[PDB]
């Protein structure tokens, strides 16, 4: 999938650089690779932390949510500040939807 991309530490070594548009904020993951997004929230300031490629076909924990949904499961159920989701379709990780 094509995924939303954010990683402030990527530019140093250039990991995945040929697949990233820094201008448009995307990363082309392989076909069969899913996306993730991670946000942190406080009062109620929602900050985007990272976005990018998550799991690939055959990996131990495949993601089969089409949309980026946050459930009452870790990390949120341990610390209410994180919002993590993974999702399988193109650009699905642009934003998150709480499903509590």
UniProtKB/Swiss-Prot annotation:
It is found in: Cell membrane. Highly expressed in heart and liver. Disulfide bonds join 3-35, 29-53, 63-86, 68-85, 87-92. Changing residue 61 to L: In PPH1; uncertain significance; unchanged subcellular localization. Glycans are attached at residues 24, 79, 95. Residues 2-100 are extracellular. Changing residue 56 to Y: In PPH1; uncertain significance; unchanged subcellular localization. On ligand binding, forms a receptor complex consisting of two type II and two type I transmembrane serine/threonine kinases. Type II receptors phosphorylate and activate type I receptors which autophosphorylate, then bind and activate SMAD transcriptional regulators. Can also mediate signaling through the activation of the p38MAPK cascade. Binds to BMP7, BMP2 and, less efficiently, BMP4. Binding is weak but enhanced by the presence of type I receptors for BMPs. Mediates induction of adipogenesis by GDF6. Promotes signaling also by binding to activin A/INHBA. Interacts with GDF5. Interacts with BMP4. Interacts with SCUBE3. Interacts with TSC22D1/TSC-22. Interacts with activin A/INHBA. It is linked to Pulmonary hypertension, primary, 1: A rare disorder characterized by plexiform lesions of proliferating endothelial cells in pulmonary arterioles. The lesions lead to elevated pulmonary arterial pression, right ventricular failure, and death. The disease can occur from infancy throughout life and it has a mean age at onset of 36 years. Penetrance is reduced. Although familial pulmonary hypertension is rare, cases secondary to known etiologies are more common and include those associated with the appetite-suppressant drugs. Belongs to the protein kinase superfamily. TKL Ser/Thr protein kinase family. TGFB receptor subfamily. This is Bone morphogenetic protein receptor type-2. It comes from Homo sapiens. The gene is BMPR2. The chain holds residues 33 to 131 of 1038 of the full protein.
């Amino acid at each position: 999938a094509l995924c939303a991309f954010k990683d402030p530490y990527q530019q140093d070594l250039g990991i995945g650089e040929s697949r990233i548009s820094h201008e448009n904020g995307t990363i082309l993951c392989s076909k069969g690779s899913t996306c993730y997004g991670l946000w942190e929230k406080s009062k109620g300031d929602i900050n985007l932390v990272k976005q990018g490629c998550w799991s690939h076909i055959g990996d131990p924990q495949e993601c089969h949510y089409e949309e980026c949904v946050v459930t009452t499961t870790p990390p949120s159920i341990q610390n209410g500040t994180y919002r993590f989701c993974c999702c399988s379709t193109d650009l699905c990780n642009v934003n998150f939807t709480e499903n509590f």
